[PDB]
Amino acid sequence: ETKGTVLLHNAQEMLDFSKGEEKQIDAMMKEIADMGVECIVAGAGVGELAL
Amino acid sequence: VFMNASQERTTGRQAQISNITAAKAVADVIRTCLGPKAMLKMLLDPMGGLVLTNDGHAILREIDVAHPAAKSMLELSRTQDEEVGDGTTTVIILAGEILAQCAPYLIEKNIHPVIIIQALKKALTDALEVIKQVSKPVDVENDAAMKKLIQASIGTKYVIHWSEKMCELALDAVKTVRKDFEIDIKRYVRVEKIPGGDVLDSRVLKGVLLNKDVVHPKMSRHIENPRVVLLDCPLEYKKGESQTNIEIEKEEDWNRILQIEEEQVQLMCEQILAVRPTLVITEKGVSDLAQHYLLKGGCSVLRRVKKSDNNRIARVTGATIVNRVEDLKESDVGTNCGLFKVEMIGDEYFSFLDNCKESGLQKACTIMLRGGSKDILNEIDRNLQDAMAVARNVMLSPSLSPGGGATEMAVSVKLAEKAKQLEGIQQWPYQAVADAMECIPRTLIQNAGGDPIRLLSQLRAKHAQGNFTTGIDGDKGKIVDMVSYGIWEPEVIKQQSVKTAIESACLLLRVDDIVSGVRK
Amino acid sequence: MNFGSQTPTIVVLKEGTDASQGKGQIISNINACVAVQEALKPTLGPLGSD
Amino acid sequence: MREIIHISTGQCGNQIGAAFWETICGEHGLDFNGTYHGHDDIQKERLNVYFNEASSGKWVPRSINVDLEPGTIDAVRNSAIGNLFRPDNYIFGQSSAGNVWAKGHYTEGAELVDSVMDVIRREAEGCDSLQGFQITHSLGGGTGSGMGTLLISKIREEFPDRMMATFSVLPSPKTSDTVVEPYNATLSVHQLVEHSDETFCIDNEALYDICQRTLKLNQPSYGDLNNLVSSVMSGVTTSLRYPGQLNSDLRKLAVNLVPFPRLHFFMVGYAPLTLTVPELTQQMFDAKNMMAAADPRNGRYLTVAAFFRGKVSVKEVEDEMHKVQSKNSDYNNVQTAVCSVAPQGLDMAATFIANSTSIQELFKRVGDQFSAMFKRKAFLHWYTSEGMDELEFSEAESNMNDLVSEYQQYQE
Amino acid sequence: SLRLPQNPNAGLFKQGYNSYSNADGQIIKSIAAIRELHQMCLTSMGPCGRNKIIVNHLGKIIITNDAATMLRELDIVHPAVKVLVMATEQQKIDMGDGTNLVM
Amino acid sequence: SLRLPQNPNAGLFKQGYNSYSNADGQIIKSIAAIRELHQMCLTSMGPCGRNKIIVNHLGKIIITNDAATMLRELDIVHPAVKVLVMATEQQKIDMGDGTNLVMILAGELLNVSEKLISMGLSAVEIIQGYNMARKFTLKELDEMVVGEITDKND
Amino acid sequence: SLQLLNPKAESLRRDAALKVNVTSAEGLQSVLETNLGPKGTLKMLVDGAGNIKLTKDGKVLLTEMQIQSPTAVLIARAAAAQDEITGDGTTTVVCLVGELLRQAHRFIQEGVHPRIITDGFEIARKESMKFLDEFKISKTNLSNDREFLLQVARSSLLTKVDADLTEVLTPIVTDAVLSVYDAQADNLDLHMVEIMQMQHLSPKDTTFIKGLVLDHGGRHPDMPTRVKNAYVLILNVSLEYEKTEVNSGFFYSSADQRDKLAASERKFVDAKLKKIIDLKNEVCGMDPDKGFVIINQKGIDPMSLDVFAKHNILALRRAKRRNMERLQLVTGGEAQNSVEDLSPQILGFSGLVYQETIGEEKFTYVTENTDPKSCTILIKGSTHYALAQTKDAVRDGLRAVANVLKDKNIIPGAGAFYIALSRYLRSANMNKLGAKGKTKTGIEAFAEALLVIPKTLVKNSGFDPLDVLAMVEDELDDAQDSDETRYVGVDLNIGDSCDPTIEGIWDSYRVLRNAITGATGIASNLLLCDELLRAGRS
Amino acid sequence: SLQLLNPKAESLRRDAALKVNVTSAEGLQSVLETNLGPKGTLKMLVDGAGNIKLTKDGKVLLTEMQIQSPTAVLIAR
């Protein structure tokens, strides 16, 4: 909520910051799905990577 | 064309004629506003309020005249109000006459406006001499005579009926502010108003009167011996001066940042509880959290109190203005507080602070006014300023001049007698000074409804033979000596009236031309 | 007792009547004649202009 | 956070607020009946910042309009834009502040403020994300100045953190006829600085110049002025109601534009006052487009922040900044915020808000009037009668010595 | 406290009528106002008196130290002055000199 | 003679303020002001009632036969007519049924009261009459009731 | 004098200033003459749009209609200031200043001075203060007579509303005032008694609630609606996020630090919720039967509402300053603001807590307390003006009955006070008084001005005002010789005299005292003023 | 009721007409009563043409000065 801004001190964080996201979102989403859900009602705007 | 001027240059004799007519017009507005039977004046300001009074100063504040010579007459009331505080209408009504009597000569016998000025300084020098001789001293410690001295000015106001209470109200207030030379000042005299109630139960109480209540409900509404401690600072965490920007890297930092906000207010509250005060009066606002542990010791928290109301609390409770809380000691804590109590009035809450009453700093106080309406409060408040102004002159100067026009009439007689022995060119303006000094009793006779022809003739016949304290009774309209009448005024008001009135004429008489509309 | 709200004062002379006191008007009258005089100043003489 | 309340106080406050809502409602789309006829998600997905979805979608703005002159509130209400605001919101009580800080303020804070704290409480309880409050007051009047000061204080007490943004309208020396304008404007700032978190300065005298120079309306009507004020407000609020990250959300605005705490005052700058990003560059920074009387060239910019709108890329703006910084170096400061939506009526605008030492001119002026033209203790009895003393005035002039000093201290 | 009640005898005599009674100050208003024209006849008095140029509405210019002749052409709005005007004319049609002494 | 004094001591209040006492047949006019929009409601009561085109400020139109709905959009000047607007608004919020009955009954009580005030009945007795009639009216509605549902779903 | 100084101005002096103060007084008197009394006419006020608000209070009429005259604004402040602290006697002040000016103006035309006339009013006022001591009657509060409080409540309520509203709303006030008296005998009106608006079935359905009612309820559906035994908790701490004084970015480097940091951000809220869970563990016994409710003064984050919903804890947010100062009086607990130091002693007690909702709004009801030190008066109404009429009626009724318990005396009304002062001032020997000269008519002017008030009550009923005082005068002529102390009244139903002692008509003590004091001060100041003018810069 | 017949008409009834009749009579009384007796004051009827005339009789004062109020016309007649 307070000044969400990237910070990358070296190239090692630059390489992993782009795929870190994929992995994390994917993990949350897989978690949601092992429960056998097939439709989710969102309350606000949904991002493209989560979609 | 030429420069921004020469619209209609009023030059020569007609320019001074308009000034004497304009200066006379200012006195005619408040001609009836003098004496014990004086009429009131309701002026309508353009903002939306209303000023109900008979004081010449308060009347001339609201009026606006688009003329430069009359505005110099307008400023003389500020000279009298911010010097003593009594006799403002006396200043305006006397000068009008001085400018008016000198006019015949200016218009006709062609005496140049500088020779009149030289005649007036010798009249001014002789006026202070006879005013010094006619005045008798009086003892300052006599409370019986002091009550009659204070109520001399109240008699020309609406609250003469409550004069038995106002003199006791004003005498107790003046002695409280009086410092043990004998210098006093009205800035600590609190003019707080309470609409409604009866004048009889209205009384002065030693201490202050706030408009606010306590914050938390569990605060003690009745304390036997309060211990007041003044605070200036915010009691809450504040942003701070420099460009700050904390950068947070770990998850255990943000909860730490919000936790030190709780611990800093604990640190400033815990050191306040080293002395264990009962009442903590903060200048700026208060937080909901610090107040909570101020409660865990037995203090009492209030809302933001303006500076003014804290400097009076510092002299009442004996505390000092404190901002740094780390340097708080036991010596600077207020003590000897009488009582704490909160009354319920529908307008707002009111917290009372009473004093134990038992050299040092001068003590302050708040005078309770219980009028009929809002205008009655403002009317009575100006009466206290006019009544308490009289009490300062007797302490600064033990002399006491007779009232009822006897002082100014004494100036009229001696200047008239000495004008014959002053043979020369200065005789005509010197004799015209007595013609205006005999008008301030003439105005009293006109308001009383009597004939000033035979009264002034009877006055001058008895003034030389009978005594120097003869005067006109404003109520009955007969000649009654001031010794038996028992009403006296200070001599300082007579000095400012004669000095300010003559010094105003010396300025306006030198006016030659009037040119309006030059530039900003 | 009065007929209305206020009562403006009377001007003694008629509205728009020009009047002035002192030595300024007689100097203006003399300067007015000198202004007419300057038109006929170079005309005087058998070597003047029309 | 998600929502911000919008208090409007005073005759100037109510007028500017009515204009502001007239702009906002049409911006992201709602007929004055509250119904949403807009297309589509972009205009609806941040509508919860300033509107309360009621059952049935009768959106209603979250605004508290207050005034001590029944008449102004009444006019606005009986007019158009009279179905949106809930009837209970208006809080209006006789008589009139009377164009006095002292009187109006104390007397009606004593009453109107209590009623306002009551309305600010329950209606707001209704949200789950207070972020702060936006107040529109007139610095120089009676009700607005006095009440504003009281309310700001009262609210800050009941909502510690909550940011606090103002859009006070500074007085016009020439066109503000009333003589006691400076003597109020001074007492208002005394308390605006101690409490507020970000404030914007708008001067009627400056508004006249822009109305007559660019717009060329022969006689400015308060209406024109109001429309221009409304446009800047709309840009700053879009900085807020459109999904975005550049200065996303109020608190961010504050952090970005406030170097140190005792400097809240901003100089709005807006163009295309009646297009290519290079064209609008000159219009933003032209010395004549400022809505502040003081000249900014003689002064010194501290933190610049430009809010573009309409079709503009990242690089259009970045290249522009690179070009501009190069020539006005004597006057590295930059902050860009591109938006996607466009001005109602025009394709692309660019609002400009920079902190500048030049405000100290607009305060040296006001202090000069306050002191010099009241060394003679003129028109003071009106204030001493209400109850407040003269020590308070001495404190007020003292704190402007301070403001001026600050700006001078940050070496103009 | 903005607009007055407008003197509720306004149902009586029309706005063109002006009353200037006493107590209000009529005598003070009059004796003074007429001091301007008193200086006119005073300056034009004696053998060294100054004649006064009076241009009427038609344009017929007259220059005189004779006071009467003056007040005949002066259109004077003040009524209290006019008592002195035709009172001086009585001296003209009758005695014939002193027009200036009686004024 | 040419002009009146035009109501002296009228500067006590503003020029825009006006008083309207019971005299001068003004209570009859208020009954007539109710009669203007009451006749609109007659053509809208029952199954053969006719809807109303009530275009509004915006242009947003609604066609309708309900007393509470139509009165929301119309801006009314007479305060006595606004009592019927808020009275029908209370009917719609609480029960949501019988708004035309409120408008047509309360308008006719003012209609028959036009005859009572003209006869010379004091206004205090008129309120006591309808209150005593109301206590008997609500009492008899419970007495002459027939039938009941007794099942939530059928 | 003012025209040559100011180029534009207005000036009235020595006859118009007197006519203005009397004409404006008679004009404003005629407005509020018909409203005075029980059978007076109602008065609506529709300002701009058509907002409607209905009441008979003179303060609402004066403080809503803008007035231009300079005299009436002083009558407005006088009528307002007397009512703002006392709550009763508004139109009485206007009638006294409205009548005392015209009753003195006839003698100003005769040529009597204004100074000596006002001197007669002041010395006559001191006689009325001496008469209040003998005219009043002592009443002991230890008896706790509920019938005496019922009769006082019907005095003001019959004036504003009819008998249908008076009978149902009278015991609502009596039950609220019955709890005011205690051993300390300290009166508290603003904190204890409150008014709240609620659009509901009708005005007649106003009921009394012994506990504190709140205008909010549970946001989530799963949270409990009704609770049998709810122990309240007061916390002034704000549980949504706290922004944090200049704190800026959670500079995150990889994507994970982000999740970690958001979780971190909450940790501050869970640190305070855990203290509530630790408090619930102490009072966990009889959890299905008992319950727990939390009331916050500031907002609560919606993320934390699910925590309370899982434990079946009722949540209420954004309470008023006054309600936090009243929960201790109702529930009997103690207040708390922080979450560090908790105990079971500060928790209150409640016998019944339930919620009822209508439309979009929802109300929370609390009642059935063990020893409630305060209560509320939830007024029902149909329209907005119906609430405003009940606002002024309850506001003026509570202040009138509360003043009876402040003192140990009460003044009977119905013209007994004014008729008694008439015979006292007209029959008292003048040699005992210190006034002499032309003070003969000043006693008669003020004594005769008081008679116009009780016949103004008759002017609304339509009877002949001079004829219904004939038997009143004849009754007091024989009552003094009959050796029977009785006080007459003015009954408007039959047009004959009555006794307020048995009928229950009463009036407070400080109302008539402050009314004549405020009226005599205003009327005296208006008489002495002999000039009006307007001047200033604008 | 009169406005329905003639919108341009006016009417004061039963309290405003009584104050007009009494105030116009008292206003006419306060101006014209000063001429009563030998010590009365002299009036100067200065019309627009500048004609000056001194008198104390109420007939010629009211004849030259036209009366606007309807009540005082009945008293002048």
Ligand SMILES: Nc1nc2c(ncn2[C@@H]2O[C@H](COP(=O)(O)OP(=O)(O)OP(=O)(O)O)[C@@H](O)[C@H]2O)c(=O)[nH]1
């Ligand atoms: N910029 C701007 N200023 C306005 C407008 N209308 C009024 N003002 C300002 O309003 C100021 C005076 O109005 P306020 O002080 O708000 O008046 P008020 O005190 O609320 O009115 P009362 O409460 O009745 O006394 C002046 O300085 C004007 O500059 C407007 O449309 N635009």
Ligand SMILES: Nc1ncnc2c1ncn2[C@@H]1O[C@H](COP(=O)(O)OP(=O)(O)O)[C@@H](O)[C@H]1O
């Ligand atoms: N009772 C009285 N009788 C006669 N003269 C009085 C009386 N009281 C005051 N005066 C005169 O009135 C003048 C002004 O007094 P006061 O009214 O107290 O001051 P101000 O003019 O400031 O109101 C004094 O110079 C005094 O001579």
Ligand SMILES: Nc1ncnc2c1ncn2[C@@H]1O[C@H](COP(=O)(O)OP(=O)(O)O)[C@@H](O)[C@H]1O
């Ligand atoms: N050479 C002179 N020496 C002394 N006095 C003179 C001389 N010439 C004229 N006067 C005086 O000047 C005065 C002018 O008076 P004037 O006003 O003309 O008389 P009237 O008013 O009768 O017409 C005369 O009274 C006369 O005495």
Ligand SMILES: Nc1ncnc2c1ncn2[C@@H]1O[C@H](COP(=O)(O)OP(=O)(O)O)[C@@H](O)[C@H]1O
């Ligand atoms: N087909 C019908 N035959 C006879 N009476 C009917 C018929 N339909 C409706 N009514 C009557 O007409 C009345 C109209 O009621 P109304 O006030 O319009 O109801 P609502 O509150 O739904 O508008 C009803 O009370 C009903 O008794």
Ligand SMILES: Nc1ncnc2c1ncn2[C@@H]1O[C@H](COP(=O)(O)OP(=O)(O)O)[C@@H](O)[C@H]1O
């Ligand atoms: N039912 C009644 N019978 C007799 N007198 C009454 C009745 N109701 C009110 N009064 C009288 O009316 C007067 C005014 O009452 P109230 O309305 O409380 O004060 P105000 O009119 O000043 O607001 C009181 O003096 C009271 O005696």
Ligand SMILES: [Mg+2]
């Ligand atoms: Mg004095």
Ligand SMILES: [Mg+2]
């Ligand atoms: Mg009452």
